Symmetry: D2
Amino acid sequence: PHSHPALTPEQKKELSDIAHRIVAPGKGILAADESTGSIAKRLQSIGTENTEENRRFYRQLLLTADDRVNPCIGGVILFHETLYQKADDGRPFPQVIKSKGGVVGIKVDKGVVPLAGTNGETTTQGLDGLSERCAQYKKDGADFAKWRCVLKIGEHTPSALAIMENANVLARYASICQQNGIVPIVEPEILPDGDHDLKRCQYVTEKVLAAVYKALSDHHIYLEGTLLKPNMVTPGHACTQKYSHEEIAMATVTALRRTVPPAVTGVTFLSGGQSEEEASINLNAINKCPLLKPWALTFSYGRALQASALKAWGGKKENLKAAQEEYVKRALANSLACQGKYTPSGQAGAAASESLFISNHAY
Amino acid sequence: PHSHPALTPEQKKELSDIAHRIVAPGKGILAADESTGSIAKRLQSIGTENTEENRRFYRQLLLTADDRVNPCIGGVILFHETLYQKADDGRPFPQVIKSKGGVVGIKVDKGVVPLAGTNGETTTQGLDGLSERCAQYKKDGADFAKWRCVLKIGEHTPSALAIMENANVLARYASICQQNGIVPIVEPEILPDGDHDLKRCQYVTEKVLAAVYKALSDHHIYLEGTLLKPNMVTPGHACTQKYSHEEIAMATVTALRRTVPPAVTGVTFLSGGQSEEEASINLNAINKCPLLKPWALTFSYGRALQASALKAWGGKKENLKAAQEEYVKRALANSLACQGKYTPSGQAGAAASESLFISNHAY
Amino acid sequence: PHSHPALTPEQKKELSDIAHRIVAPGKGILAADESTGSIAKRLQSIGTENTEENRRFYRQLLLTADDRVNPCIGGVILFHETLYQKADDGRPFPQVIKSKGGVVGIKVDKGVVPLAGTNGETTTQGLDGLSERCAQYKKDGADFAKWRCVLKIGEHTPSALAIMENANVLARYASICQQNGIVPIVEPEILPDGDHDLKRCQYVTEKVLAAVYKALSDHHIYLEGTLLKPNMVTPGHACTQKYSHEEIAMATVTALRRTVPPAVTGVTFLSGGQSEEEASINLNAINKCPLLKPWALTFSYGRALQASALKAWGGKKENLKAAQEEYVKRALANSLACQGKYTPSGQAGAAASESLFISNHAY
Amino acid sequence: PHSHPALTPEQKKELSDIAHRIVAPGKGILAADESTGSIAKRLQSIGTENTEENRRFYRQLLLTADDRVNPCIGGVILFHETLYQKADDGRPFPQVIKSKGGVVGIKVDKGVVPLAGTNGETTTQGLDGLSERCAQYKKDGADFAKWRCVLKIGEHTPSALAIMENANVLARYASICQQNGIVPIVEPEILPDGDHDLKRCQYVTEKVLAAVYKALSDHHIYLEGTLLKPNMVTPGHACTQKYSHEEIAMATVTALRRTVPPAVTGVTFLSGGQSEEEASINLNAINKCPLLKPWALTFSYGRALQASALKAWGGKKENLKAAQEEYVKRALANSLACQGKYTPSGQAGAAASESLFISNHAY
């Protein structure tokens, strides 16, 4: 019943300020924090040996895209290795990012681990020595971090244990970060795996997020100094029923409206398997959703921003500009999407301002 | 992790429509649901004996004020007895309320009871047979209900148990109401008693509200079909440090933004002992607060709407018009306050300047 | 983190002594607290009109059984109506019970109610005015109470909500009881309904009891002044797999050892659908189980003690002695069973009890 | 509500067998797991350099005492470094411990870390990569582990967050340990620091342990395959009021009976600042306590088994025999104590209980 301020007004100001710059109007996040083992699959996808040099070159390719991306990228999430690499001109990658108006982020979790006694569920590790790591990352250029928890929709999942444990570890991570001037991106990803429908995903997302925010409160987390990175609300990959982008958007915004306090500075959606186009189209529908949204609704895309670029590159320096052009096009596409004015391929009429309510009580 | 819809789309629409009508722009709630023992004290402050006729008469006085209050009153909360009473023209009070554009509400809790093992803390009873009572109240004209839980700030309070139990019983009450077409007003009042400062009250309010919404989520409550009746955030009644109305508004709105999901249809503040003018001024400052507020911010005043009226009446039926006049004055003021367009004028008498604070079991 | 003693050393002593008298060596509980609606099904099964007089005659039949039951019955649970009825000689039934060495008990819950948003799950009501009721019951001869919660094993049940809510209400009930000198019997019954196997029941029983005791701790319940009335751990009624009484006992005792604190004075099993003989055999096997059992393991049987007596009576006064003989026989059998001395034939000579091989690691 | 066996019958047996061996009758644990930082203060107290060799020598001094300690020591906890050191005869310490009939334990936590927003409270880290570490330790001779959480009695401590978080991390540690065949000793130490009295310590201990066991249940922990290392219930080290050993013993046994499920194999008390004698006297009084104790009540002492040994050594190799003598002396004393067969008054041993005085309802 007694307060013991976790943060001073100055510390709050800094975190809030960082949080806002990242999701400023028209801006989103480039999630380029793939771990060595995760990026291996990407490189092998284009037949390229997973060496530090190729990774460095690939990250350079994205980080050094022309100034057209500047207004589209509020932040860039990097994997440890990349935070300490430099471009050809000798400039540290963090310097490259900042010179283009982007805030530098660092992934800090150490991957998922299995939860004994559950049906293949997990929690995430990475808290050991996290305070020291955050202080070091801060000194070396990072202003925000990312920690990913993973939940699965199944017959008996996500279980009460999985929900409770992942929410709690996310809160511990958030607390440590804020203690070190680092804005924590809270990512409670609910996988799209399965044949469940849209209603099921919405229900689970609502329950997971309510658990997440209660844990953040219990751990005295300063919400204005945080960002949420959730899954959009969609049917499972194996669901035979079909939905429009407008219904996906309605279910997503409805779920967020019932669980995310207005104080949360922004929601940066993960793309989780959606194609570049789909991810952009859904984000657009979300921002055009009639309902009131008290927070920025933007992106924190990995594959949805890199797919075509990685392919165009093919691991050949020769394809440098061709590759960057693909990334640039998706950056521009999603910048408009987070503003509610994106239209795939060709379309007449620029801003795409319109309205309509679909049922709204059916969710 | 499996959904078992507590409500159909049709039931949701009805609850949502009801909640919105009660807090429509410029509209607030008149809380005239004082129990027999409670209203009795008010009658004594004016030397009026506590009889059924006197109570009926007093309630008629408020409910039959001139049509100027129509735009100001979205709902009226009544006590069981009054729900079945009639005005001088033979019309049941619910019919009177409705004919003036108001929604009829009914208080359904059965008072507070002590929580053993705590330092004078309580929870609230009233769930027994609540479903049947709600079904009956619905048929008799009521569309919303009210249930009051009480918490106190002290050295060891509110305790974890008090917070958890009160949040849980509020959720049970909300669940039963929604199953019967009644919109539940969730009232977790944190008393102003004590010498704590603004910060302390904000901290406790944030912790209490976080608990309330986690419980509502656990019990599958449809937030869009509910309203919240919290205490404004203010320093203790015995606190020496002075604060501006802008500070009170800042702390109140900040606490709500950090805990109340956008889906909640509206917040109807309890006056909790503030003078009529004080209550109106703070509500106005709250609506003028720069921060984004995704829910209607209005009033559900008892004392802050009846102070001068009771004084003007004095039990003498000759002062009927005099009394009603004072009531209309406060309804008009608060109607403007909930729109951030109120400016004191200089009237309301000294009766609106006096505080309506009442302790509990001496001190 | 501060203690606010809910009970004085004197109140604790009273509650502890009551609880121990009820489950003293060789004693169990006669559960004759069937509500009028519930007892209607019993009277109808023997073609008997459900009148207050027949109910009185039947309760009288059980309560006035010869002195052989005296050392067998530590307590008798009564329904409100019966607590105020008198034997033919004019003696209040509570006096009749006490003169035979029994402690008087009273059922205080008001039945189950549906939990919205669940798959047919319930919680139990009855807290309203419970303190006043307990004070009156205490004054009128009762020293312990009974409150029944019901949970079901299904595809998605018992749900987290169901477990949490029922555990919480039982705690409130226990807290009120203790403030009035009444020893509360905590009954969280997991129905035998379904085709689940033995291990599934043990799993659920373990989780339910863990939640029950955490709630009792949160509400500051004095365990030494309470009794537990749980279901035995058995396969579902529709389960095809067959189990021995030794397996039922092992599963039951293991579940209890893993969740019930040693401070709990006693465990009084409900028969829940088992025949009179199987309920007795299992209780006996439970008491012979080769594991440390820090609490009395006895009975609180309804049908398992009344089945034959009811049928033998058939509503005919001429069958009084015959019906009472059937009750006394089961009372004697279970008295021996709660001591592990039950055999289809035994008095003052035994040396059996051979049970080799049972790897409790399989539980 | 659905089981997903965390362990197989074989895994359960292994853990249970290990836990039982450690606490077999008359056996206790030697806690020599002081980290470099903690052991440094031990050597410094006796003016000895904190080199690897001196640490290896001191540990050798304790681990190679004569066979008289064999019946007294069921297990020995080591710090990482020591687990990989060897005695003068070339035998690795794990082999030395085992050849004397002891089970080898390994401390696996990575120290406490501050919980932001609390009044100097902490949680403990060390879960990262714990599974792989456990698998390696098992291969290298360890069969059980230790993890220490620290809580403190203060004005507003232990807080709800501190209790919840420490209970949760202990559960995570226990879960990982059991997946690797390692018996986890759960240590939720409530410090003796402060001027609080016996009642307060008993209250906090009861609340802490209830939280610990609910967390263990939520995480599907196999209690029979665990040990509990709690603080005895005592007044604060600076408490003005004074108590007797019998009062400490009653408070301790009562707190445990109200929270520790019978299924827990054993309770190994930490000495927490108590002198060698006091720790032995209290453990004796605990085992002599009239109340029923369903678990072994033994010791896991560090300072209480090493105080005199370290002092007699002084860092001089010629004081080997004298130092070991002091340790054997305390080992013998405590071995008798964990059986309630220890008498102080010098080298005595021919006295039993005396002075009849029940009144245990005062706790």
